[PDB]
Amino acid sequence: LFLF
C-alpha cells in the first residue's frame, strides 16, 4: 500500500 505504498502504493501496495
How long a stretch of residues is the chain? 4
Question: Grid cell 500500500 — which residue?
Answer: 1
Q: Is 3 helix (H, G, I), strand (E, B) or coil?
A: coil
Q: The C-alpha cell of 4 is what? A: 501496495
Resolution in Å, one decimal place: 0.8
Q: How far is CA 3 from the centre of its chain?
A: 2
